[PDB]
Amino acid sequence: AQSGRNVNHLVFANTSYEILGGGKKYNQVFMTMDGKLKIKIDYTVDDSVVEGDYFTVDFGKYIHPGTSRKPYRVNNIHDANGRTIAIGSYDSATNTAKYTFTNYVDIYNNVRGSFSLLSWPFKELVTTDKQSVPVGITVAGEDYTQNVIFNYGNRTVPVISDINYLTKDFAEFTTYINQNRAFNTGSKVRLSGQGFKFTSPDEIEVYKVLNNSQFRDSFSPDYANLTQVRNPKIIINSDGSATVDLGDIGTLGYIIRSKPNTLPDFSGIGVLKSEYTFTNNKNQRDTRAHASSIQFVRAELAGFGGFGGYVWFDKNNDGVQNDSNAAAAGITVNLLDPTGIRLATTTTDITGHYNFDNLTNGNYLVEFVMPEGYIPTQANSTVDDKDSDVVFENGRYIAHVTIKDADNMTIDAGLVSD
Ligand SMILES: [K+]
Ligand SMILES: [K+]
Ligand SMILES: [K+]
Ligand SMILES: [K+]
Ligand SMILES: [K+]
Numbered sequence: 278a279q280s281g282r283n284v285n286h287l288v289f290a291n292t293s294y295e296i297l298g299g300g301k302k303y304n305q306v307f308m309t310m311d312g313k314l315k316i317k318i319d320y321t322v323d324d325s326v327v328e329g330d331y332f333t334v335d336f337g338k339y340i341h342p343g344t345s346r347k348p349y350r351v352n353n354i355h356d357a358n359g360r361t362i363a364i365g366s367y368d369s370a371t372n373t374a375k376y377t378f379t380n381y382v383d384i385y386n387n388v389r390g391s392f393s394l395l396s397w398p399f400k401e402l403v404t405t406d407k408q409s410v411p412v413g414i415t416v417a418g419e420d421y422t423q424n425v426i427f428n429y430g431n432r433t434v435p436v437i438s439d440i441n442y443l444t445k446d447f448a449e450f451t452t453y454i455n456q457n458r459a460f461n462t463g464s465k466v467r468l469s470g471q472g473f474k475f476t477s478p479d480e481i482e483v484y485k486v487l488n489n490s491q492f493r494d495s496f497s498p499d500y501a502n503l504t505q506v507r508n509p510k511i512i513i514n515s516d517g518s519a520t521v522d523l524g525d526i527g528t529l530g531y532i533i534r535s536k537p538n539t540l541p542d543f544s545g546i547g548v549l550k551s552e553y554t555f556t557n558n559k560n561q562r563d564t565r566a567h568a569s570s571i572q573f574v575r576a577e578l579a580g581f582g583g584f585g586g587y588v589w590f591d592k593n594n595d596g597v598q599n600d601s602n603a604a605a606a607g608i609t610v611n612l613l614d615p616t617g618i619r620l621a622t623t624t625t626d627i628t629g630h631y632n633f634d635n636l637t638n639g640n641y642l643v644e645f646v647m648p649e650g651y652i653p654t655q656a657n658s659t660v661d662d663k664d665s666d667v668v669f670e671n672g673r674y675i676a677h678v679t680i681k682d683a684d685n686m687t688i689d690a691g692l693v694s695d
Pocket of ligand 4: 662664665687689
């Protein structure tokens, strides 16, 4: 890995916020419409900054980068030609992004520009509709704060729901029942997804609510302080919908915390519909429903992957991995963007292997630095798990790799004397 230092003191950032979505005209982030908080950063970089140095963005107490999909990520920073200025990484433990300068800063001087991020509140802290919070962050060591109002549009109604968060494999959906605290009997809830399916009752948890304050407007309840119905009557239907029989709830509120699975190959507007059927305090049957929507493409939902490979001395010059005592240790491997900027570096270990992990989805070049007197062997001469993948292309010894939500791709290099 490329070494470097924290250069917050050499990068100057000017920051502003912009509220996006339907609440902009009300100066509010409308969390269940299309709302998010856009962070806009203008930055300058001193000439003394070098490849591997980095600046940080501390997102502080109330917000994180990204929106619905976890784990959260940040994108790389590019110039107008698409060249990578800095690679972006995010650590959830410190709620901080790290922007590590590439060799861009060793080609170009007076580096400066702008980038932006989308951000969302921690729903366990920003709990309440119309709540103003001091959104204080630090960008390259420069503090910025502004008060921002969030609104989830919670309503005191028999049934309402939201998607709490989304992951590669499942979403967590929150269904609130009887916030209106009507006397209800014969209460049942049917959960039906598009782009999502249930397989098992253990994917659904049911909680009683005695105090309305526990119905967080953010739809991310403090479950540790709610009594769980640990034996709930749940049926998974043949179509992958689920029915929850709550029984005679009386005036109690209920929360259903569900984790439907994302469907393989799904691409579009996913939906979970919560349909609540019950007998009201007039002894009349009633049916009410609420549906929550989320755009996703399952195949790229993680947003990152990784790859690695193997370097060896191709002792019989055939381009095949059929050579003994041949692993090449200490070979430098550089990861480049398509413009030729170096994003990362590593070296093969004693076993001949290298890898790059936690790589944002996209197209990369993989460059192998030749030991003195060596060149790549014949490329692509056999089956793709036993060949050498490196060619001389555009002045470099490289292979191409595309990262898309997988870490099983391999890129190997066989070496022969020149
Ligand atoms: K600074
Ligand atoms: K420099
Ligand atoms: K060989
Ligand atoms: K290969
Ligand atoms: K190949």
